[PDB]
Amino acid sequence: VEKNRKIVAENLEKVQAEAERLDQEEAQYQREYSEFKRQQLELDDELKSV
Amino acid sequence: EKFHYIYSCDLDINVQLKIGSLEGKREQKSYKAVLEDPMLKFSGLYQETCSDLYVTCQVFAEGKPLALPVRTSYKAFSTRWNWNEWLKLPVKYPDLPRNAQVALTIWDVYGPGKAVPVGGTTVSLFGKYGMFRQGMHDLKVWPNVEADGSEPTKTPGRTSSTLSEDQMSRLAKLTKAHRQGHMVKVDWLDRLTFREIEMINESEKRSSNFMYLMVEFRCVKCDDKEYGIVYYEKDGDESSP
Amino acid sequence: NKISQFKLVLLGESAVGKSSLVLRFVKGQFHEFQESTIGAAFLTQTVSLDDTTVKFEIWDTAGLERYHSLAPMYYRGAQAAIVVYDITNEESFARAKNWVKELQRQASPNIVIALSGNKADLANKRAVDFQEAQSYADDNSLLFMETSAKTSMNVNEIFMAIAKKLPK
Amino acid sequence: QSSSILKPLLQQGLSDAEEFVIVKALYALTCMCQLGLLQKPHVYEFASDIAPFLCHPNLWIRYGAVGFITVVARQISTADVYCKLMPYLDPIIQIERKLVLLSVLKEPVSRSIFDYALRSKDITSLFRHLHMRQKKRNGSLPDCPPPEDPAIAQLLKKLLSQGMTEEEEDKLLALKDFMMKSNKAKANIVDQSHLHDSSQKRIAKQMMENAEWESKPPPPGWRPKGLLVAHLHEHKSAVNRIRVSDEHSLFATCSNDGTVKIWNSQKMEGKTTTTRSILTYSRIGGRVKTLTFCQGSHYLAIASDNGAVQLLGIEASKLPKSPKIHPLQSRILDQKEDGCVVDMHHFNSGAQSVLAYATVNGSLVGWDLRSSSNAWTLKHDLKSGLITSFAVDIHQCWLCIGTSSGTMACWDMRFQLPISSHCHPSRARIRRLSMHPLYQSWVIAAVQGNNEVSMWDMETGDRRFTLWASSAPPLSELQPSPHSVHGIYCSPADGNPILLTAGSDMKIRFWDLAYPERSYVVAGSTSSPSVSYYRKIIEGTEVVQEIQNKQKVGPSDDTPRRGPESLPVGHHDIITDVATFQTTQGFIVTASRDGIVKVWK
Amino acid sequence: LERQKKALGREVALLHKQQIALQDKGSAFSAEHLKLQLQKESLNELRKEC
Ligand SMILES: Nc1nc2c(ncn2[C@@H]2O[C@H](COP(=O)(O)OP(=O)(O)OP(=O)(O)O)[C@@H](O)[C@H]2O)c(=O)[nH]1
Ligand SMILES: [Mg+2]
């Protein structure tokens, strides 16, 4: 029980550390993704000029 | 007029608030399971079993812990211990100092394999203009150490004023909703806009995952309006369309 | 044909089944895991009777007592209410009476009030006798049915009873 | 509360057994309900578990307690530890311990005070809650326990006490608990206690360098036919935007190039020369993105595609039909890496002056005009698309906005937030938005195809009216592209007129809130103008059948030419903007996409 | 108790987060490379030329 407890318990921290990590790059990717709207805006705007 | 405004020493009699529920830090189970902690190496031996906290509270003018402590009975933590007790101290309003502080702590109430859990908090009486009535309904945070939300002691809920910003915009609008502030519409469109405010409450609820709690109080006899017994010109703060 | 619109408010103690009742009526759905409502939810559904399409604008209120102070905003100008209790909970019925009282005192005098004795599928754990609830309903001109959002028993029927009583 | 006296009492000392006996009569006089009120005695008991005071008589009172203690909430569980002192005090402990162990054998064995944790059997707050509901019923409740001796174990007796009923718990799973745990004596002590229970029962910038004027609404305008009185142009380039001053209906216009083109309406009323030549110009030095007049002012605010924004003060003499001419940028506002999007400026009567413009990120940014500095910010979302129209409430309180995705979004400015969204199913990019008397309902100008207007009630979310040029009553998608692309003008006042461009037919229809049936259009048609504008119903909307006699339009080109030659006199591109002004009589301007204007009276 | 609560907590957090993450990343980036990288170019040609 003790060995496997330690093994099982401490790796949850490591697993969840990566889950928090996902939240970070996702925040960056959201800004990247937000620029898609900027590009869309520009295209739509000058297309409305067309 | 100030609803025919009258002084603090022109008041006379006891008080009766009310007291609701809380949003938890979740360190162990709702109600109780026997305290969840990986340092159980020693801690398991301490007979930690399922349990139930309670609390006690008194008051101090800091330097004298003046008030009578008073304890709590039982309600299921499935309710998040939502009491909505209406809760009273016979302390005549004139008997109350303008600078004084509440003192409350978690304790225990249902015979544990444990010793009765601490968990403090402290906060002030008066509003900015000194009237205790500024405190009437409110919210606060704290742990096994000790904290406040509206007037923070040193733990979860640790800064008071600037935290509310959009929530402070909600406080400014709460003063108008209280006054029935007359310069803007409150028709059924705005009634349904209050449906939208019911929505915004929940945003606050995410942020509430720290350690928050709900507090209440208001008068029996009404229309009436009052202030302190000494004077300063804060009433110069006034407005019109 | 003609369309008549009415604001309807759901009131009652938390967990009595207000959101379940309205989900059943609106969507023909029921979730064992229904989430407790925060604030109030807007829903709409119609019934048809006497060639009239009766469209309910429904405010499903959070029953939790902290939200009590918000209730008058949602029932102001409401032409119908359903006050819901849980038949397995006699205290939910005491709270239901106090909602009915508040409505008598503070709502529009014309309000058509329905009383729902919900969770009637759990009749073997009944705490509230049918005839007690009926006697209270009759005495106060409330439309009373025992309902079950779970099974759908009397769900459509209570909304139809309201529609019939409303001025059209 | 006030029965806490039970604790401090033990601080008074006496070793007279008589006192301990009066205390046994007091213990008899005291087995009490409140969860806390038991602990004052617990701790008196602690004094007594330091020093036992009355030997075997004490031992018997303790024995009486122990069987009741064989029932326990966890509220009782603190007393278990206290009770370990009573055996810890060697009475040959093990014989009395054995006798009592038989009397409370919830599990078979244990050891010292901490080792007291082991021999567990379950407490129950649950069935006791049911039992508190049953504080209502006693008698039969002492009659069912002896039958429970058989019903559990033996067969000595059976019961027919259904005369008392109360089946529901026995009918439910609550029946099970007695077989498992629940038993009679606890319930009799509890019944005693239940009887006890029963017994208890504004102008800081605007007056620095700007001038001032007051607004001038027309009379009801459904009555006049309009005859084309004048024709003119800003430049060949499309009109960047149009604005008409309240003062002298001073007419402001500009070329796409960023070159201004202004005129005096009273000069035109007099000299009549005004169509040939510009009254006033200004060098912007870049393409005009937007125009809006300063509310209550002669000043004019202009923004450029570089992000740069500025406010011109008017320098002019006051001589009849003869103003001196000079443009003067009085104040400047920053260009940025974020470019501009268009704006209207608002002095608020009994309240302050502010101007609001969208940034290139879509965000509304709302500057206090007097400060020439920001006062509020409201951020639009990539999901809505860009702004396709901008509108505001009468007191400015609710903003109303049409998106490039065919969603309508509103912002409570009183709360400084987007309130919510709606999106009429066809979800096309909104042309324009506006408000009418009966302010509760609002006009949306391009979602869906063959429909001219999807007028919808703001509180409802819903198209209370739907107007279509279609021969069929439902919205057959018979619209060419220009049917969805048009100018519109409405009045929340002034006898409730509405004017509407039909870009499919390139013409000005009229629709009078006073009479939809009698709505004589203001502008003509070459073939057949007359309109039987009769409203029908199909339940869900009060659909207006614009039965134009021989309109001659559909979703394809079934006529050889059908373009610029087919207009009431004054050939042109679609009416980009149409507006009413009232310098003497009421009269109207049509500004086309072609940098060209025609005036009607 | 340990095994249950950890099984409960880990499995839920993991499985939902795995599924939602795989989806939301997949979708957001695909949209860019399918559209940012395509629609924009298409409507640039019909902007500048046209
Ligand atoms: N057996 C049974 N369960 C029901 C019935 N109606 C609702 N429930 C359940 O009771 C619980 C609470 O139901 P809700 O609809 O969320 O209750 P509510 O009145 O809306 O509660 P609040 O939003 O907190 O005020 C959920 O688990 C529902 O699935 C019913 O008719 N029969
Ligand atoms: Mg609900």
Cα gap D332→D313, rounded to integer Å: 12
Task: Please state, in angstroms and as integers, the Cα–Cα distance from residue A42 to each residue in A31, A47, D362, D427, D444, following that order.
Answer: 17, 8, 11, 20, 25
Contact D230, D598 (CB under 8 A): yes
Q: What is the residue whose two structure tokens read 């605007």? A: D206
For chain A, helix (H) and strand (E) counts, in that order, are 1, 0
Chain E: residue whose CA lies nearest to A13: E10
The closest of D340, D402, D426, E44 to A40, measured between CA atoms, is E44
| Residue D522, both tokens | 């203001």
Cα gap D234→E35, rounded to integer Å: 39
Helices marked H in D224-340 — which ranges? Answer: 265-270
- What amino acid is encoded at C116 in this protein? S
Say if the Cβ atoms of C125 and D172 lie within 8 Å: yes
Say if the Cβ atoms of A34 and D382 lie within 8 Å: yes
**Whether A10 contacts chain D with CB within 8 A:** no
Q: Cα–Cα–Cα angle for D437, C45, C6, nearest 5°? A: 50
| Residue D583, both tokens | 């310098």
| Residue D476, both tokens | 């057959």
| CA C35 / ligand 2 centre spacing (Å) | 7
Cα gap B199→B221, rounded to integer Å: 33
| CA C155 / ligand 1 centre spacing (Å) | 14
Say if the Cβ atoms of D539 and C124 lie within 8 Å: no
List all residues whose CB is within 6 A of at least one atom of ligand 1: C 12, 14-20, 32, 34, 36-37, 62-64, 118-119, 121-122, 148-150
DSSP state of D212: B
Q: Cα–Cα–Cα angle for C125, C128, C131, nearest 5°? A: 125
Cα gap C38→D38, rounded to integer Å: 40
Say if the Cβ atoms of C74 and B191 lie within 8 Å: yes
Beta carbons within 8 Å of D329's beta carbon, 6+ residues apart: D282, D310, D311, D312
Say if the Cβ atoms of D172 and C124 lie within 8 Å: yes
Which residues of D369-475 form beta strands (DSSP E)?
373-378, 387-392, 398-403, 408-412, 417-422, 433-435, 441-444, 451-453, 456-457, 467-468
Positions at the binding site of C: 14-15, 17-20, 31-32, 37, 63, 118-119, 121, 149-150
| Residue D383, both tokens | 């999901």
Cα gap D229→D125, rounded to integer Å: 91
DSSP state of B240: -
Cα gap B125→B108, rounded to integer Å: 26
| CA C82 / ligand 2 centre spacing (Å) | 13
Q: What is the residue whose two structure tokens read 């409960």? A: E8
| CA D579 / ligand 1 centre spacing (Å) | 57
Work out how many CB contacts closer than 8 A connect A with D: 16
Q: Which atom, in ligand 1's list, is nearest to the CA of C16?
A: 19
How many of the other CB atoms lie within 10 Å of CB of A29? Answer: 15
* Angle, helix C155-165 to helix C18-27, in steps of 10 degrees: 80
Say if the Cβ atoms of B195 and C67 lie within 8 Å: no
Separation of CA D83 from chain center: 60
Contact B124, B138 (CB under 8 A): no
How many of the other CB atoms lie within 10 Å of CB of B173? Answer: 15
Q: What is the residue whose two structure tokens read 């819901």? A: C84
DSSP state of D383: G
Separation of CA B191 from chain center: 27
DSSP state of B69: P
Beta bridge partners of C58: C8, C43
Q: Is the dihedral of CA D475, D480, D484, D487 positive or negative?
A: negative
Chain D: residue whose CA lies nearest to C123: D168
| Residue D540, both tokens | 């869900």
Contact B98, B125 (CB under 8 A): yes
The closest of D536, D550, D437, D546 to D500, measured between CA atoms, is D546
Q: D510-543 burial by CB neighbour count: b if 16+ within 10 A, else e? A: bbbbeebeebebbbebeeebebebeeeeeeebbb
The closest of C106, C161, C168, C112 to C141, measured between CA atoms, is C112
**Whether D172 contacts chain C with CB within 8 A:** yes
Report the first-to-last Cα separation within chain B, whole angstroms: 19
Cα gap A4→D235, rounded to integer Å: 83
Q: Is the dihedral of CA B199, B204, B210, B215 positive or negative?
A: negative
Contact D23, D17 (CB under 8 A): no
Task: Please state, in angstroms and as integers, the Cα–Cα distance from residue D380 to each residue in B79, B169, C48, D83, D363, following that order.
Answer: 39, 20, 40, 69, 5
- What amino acid is encoded at D41 in this protein? P
Q: Cα–Cα–Cα angle for D387, D391, D397, nearest 5°? A: 120
The minimal CB distance from E17 to the residues A8, A19, A43 is found for A19
Chain D: residue whose CA lies nearest to C1: D539
**Whether B191 contacts chain C with CB within 8 A:** yes
CA distance D412 to chain B (A): 8
- CA-closest residue to ligand 1 atom 22: C14
Q: Is the dihedral of CA B217, B221, B224, B229 positive or negative?
A: negative
Q: What is the residue whose two structure tokens read 């027919």? A: D160
- Give me the DSSP letters along D90-120: ---HHHHHHHHHHTT-SSS---SSGGGGSS-
Ligand nearest to the CA of C71: 1
Contact D260, D327 (CB under 8 A): yes
| CA D586 / ligand 2 centre spacing (Å) | 57
| Residue D118, both tokens | 């082991």
Resolution (A): 9.8
Contact C24, C30 (CB under 8 A): yes
CA atoms within 13 A on the CB side of D356: 19
Cα gap B96→B104, rounded to integer Å: 18
Q: Which atom, in ligand 1's list, is nearest to the CA of C23?
A: 15
DSSP state of D333: E
- Give the H or E element holding residue D366: strand D364-368
Positions at the binding site of C for Mg(2+): 19, 37
CA distance A39 to chain E (A): 8
Work out how many CB contacts closer than 8 A connect B with C: 36
Helices marked H in chain B — which ranges? Answer: 40-43, 166-179, 188-207
In this complex, does chain E touch chain C, defined as having at least 3 beta-carbon pairs under 8 Å apart? Answer: no
Contact D276, D268 (CB under 8 A): no
Interface test with D, best of B34, B87, B88, B109 (most D CBs within 10 A): B109
Q: Which atom, in ligand 1's list, is nearest to the CA of C84?
A: 19
Chain B contacts of D417, Cβ < 8 Å?
Answer: 200
Contact D458, B192 (CB under 8 A): no
Helices marked H in B44-83 — which ranges? Answer: none
What is chain E's Cα-based Rg?
21
Contact D342, D352 (CB under 8 A): no
- What amino acid is encoded at B41 in this protein? K
Q: Which atom, in ligand 1's list, is nearest to the CA of C122?
A: 1
